[PDB]
Paper text:
Sliding DNA clamps are processivity factors that are required for efficient DNA replication. The β subunit of the holoenzyme is required for efficient processivity in bacteria. This protein factor wraps around double-stranded DNA at primer-template junctions, where it serves as a sliding clamp to tether the polymerase enzyme to its DNA substrate. Here we present the crystal structure of the β subunit of DNA polymerase III from [name], a Gram-positive bacterium.
Numbering used by the authors:
A (entry chain B): 2 to 60, 66 to 377
B (entry chain A): 1 to 60, 66 to 377
Write the structure that this text describes.
Amino acid sequence: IQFSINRTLFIHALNTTKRAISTKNAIPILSSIKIEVTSTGVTLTGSNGQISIENTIPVGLLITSPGAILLEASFFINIISSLPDISINVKEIEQHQVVLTSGKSEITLKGKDVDQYPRLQEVSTENPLILKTKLLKSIIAETAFAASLQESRPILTGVHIVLSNHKDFKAVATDSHRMSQRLITLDNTSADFMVVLPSKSLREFSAVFTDDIETVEVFFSPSQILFRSEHISFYTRLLEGNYPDTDRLLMTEFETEVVFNTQSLRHAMERAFLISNATQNGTVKLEITQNHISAHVNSPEVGKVNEDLDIVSQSGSDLTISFNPTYLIESLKAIKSETVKIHFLSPVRPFTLTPGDEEESFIQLITPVRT
Amino acid sequence: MIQFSINRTLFIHALNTTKRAISTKNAIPILSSIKIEVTSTGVTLTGSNGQISIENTIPVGLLITSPGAILLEASFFINIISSLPDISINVKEIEQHQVVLTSGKSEITLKGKDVDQYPRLQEVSTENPLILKTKLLKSIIAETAFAASLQESRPILTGVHIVLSNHKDFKAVATDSHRMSQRLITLDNTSADFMVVLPSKSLREFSAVFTDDIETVEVFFSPSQILFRSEHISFYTRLLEGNYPDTDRLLMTEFETEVVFNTQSLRHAMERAFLISNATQNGTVKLEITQNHISAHVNSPEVGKVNEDLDIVSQSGSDLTISFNPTYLIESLKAIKSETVKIHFLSPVRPFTLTPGDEEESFIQLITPVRT
């Protein structure tokens, strides 16, 4: 290996790739980063067994001789970041050793051969799903958080994504207490699919694909999914199994509706949480009457909250309903609309939230606690 | 019972300052609380963690209606206050040590405790104050605190030795018997002699508590603690008892070699040296000084090697090769504000000194090398 590259540009590509490398690796060799170089550019590869990133730096960069080597990720990344001048010269020598040279500083690191690094799977090469990056990042911010965090039921730790009739896109996540569903009609037909992707993997995707990347190509396989842009390949294992029916849970009718300013209600709920979080399963009680809406929390020997809430509008019947404020807090953080429409059926049935904006088909459900 | 209204932003700032003296975990449970005493002239907030105590007073915006005193869990109380909606908060104590906090349409009631459950402050005489400028005190701290020892095995090394001799010679020194940092100052006005050792962490908190808008502070001494006081802030610190080691006897007479480097570039070079030497426990860097040729070297049998030519400002004296733990030099350089640093070496096995290049301060640091 022999090539010279702009340091800054190199640190960015490396940081992105490092998102796929765990701090602790049960599989030793995976703590390393793969560096491959051919005549057209430098390709970095990191992995932790759940996700894999292949980032390509296209020839800021001039290559002298092709090659491949593995280096301890963090260690190497730290080193590169601390290099003197803007330019850096990478040159491999006998016994898989790399000689980095920048400014008046020269540092040699001992690597290992690529042969011992797991090879990537070949995900189906067919006409992928084309998705706009900001839409996918929007879907992720609205659903990933609703997925359960307990491995008790693995399937629920991911976001269920399904394409029907070659055009009806659905993304749903749930934890048996709250649910989030985003529906979208693609502008172009495409092959049907149905997968469950780890929430953690989706979060990384948003961190990896910067907003300068307009669209990504999506490819599917039974155990793995690939998100691909011009120079970045993001792989992730899928959660195998059957994701429960969720359409059945969609509340059709309601008895009460209240529209709130999203931000103001979130703050009131965060206020309630500070007190309710004092006990396990602590809840907030919402009292809805005509032109009077209040939140109440009572934590014996700790404190209590009594707060009157402002609303935009309301309809239907009066109602008193209790629930864990954290679910509502998180649901509101996911709603970018200035207002939020909340639909209730009764004190013991789930209530649903939709953006007052009506800019998208975004529905959330939260299950109340009976008192 | 307590009753006052206060500006939310003002309250939060004062609370977060006091919270600096309140530990996350507490062996003595009651120390997790913040003590609030309301008097005719202001609201005084007190926090302590067994090492330091902070009494911060908000002077009478703030409107006080009735006097009182109460204890509330600090972190919890502050998060609540910070979460209130309106610009102003009304605080009203009711029966059974409870306070009703009202801000806008939000009413939050909290359960508290009687102040008699809180330990009393070990008072310190307010007579014959030593007056020091805040920026000067903060400068001394940032230059010596880091050199103290963390090892509890020997308490005294954990603090910074501060001594005033001949009523005018001020000395602040700290060491980990590996490296040392010393600051000498001559007072313009004579003041009573003193000699104490202050826990280094307690000094770092001083800098965080007294904001720069505060020109000076009054310093009072007692055998067990020292009190730093501004107009509205009283900061107490427990003192480390014992005989501090004779550190004057460590200053090096002459030097055989001297080199002047750009403070920052040398720090950057040493940081790279650390990235490799750190791989090997007790890892060290090797400095090779010869006529117009200075270079750093590190060789880790596993991860890699370091060969770096060091740019210099000026040199003089004999050639020399010396090895030392880089982290020590890195930290010494971080403490030097001047563009350049002057390094004086003796033998490969003798401590080498560092002093600011602009020579505006009598700031000397000593670093013990490693016998290669």
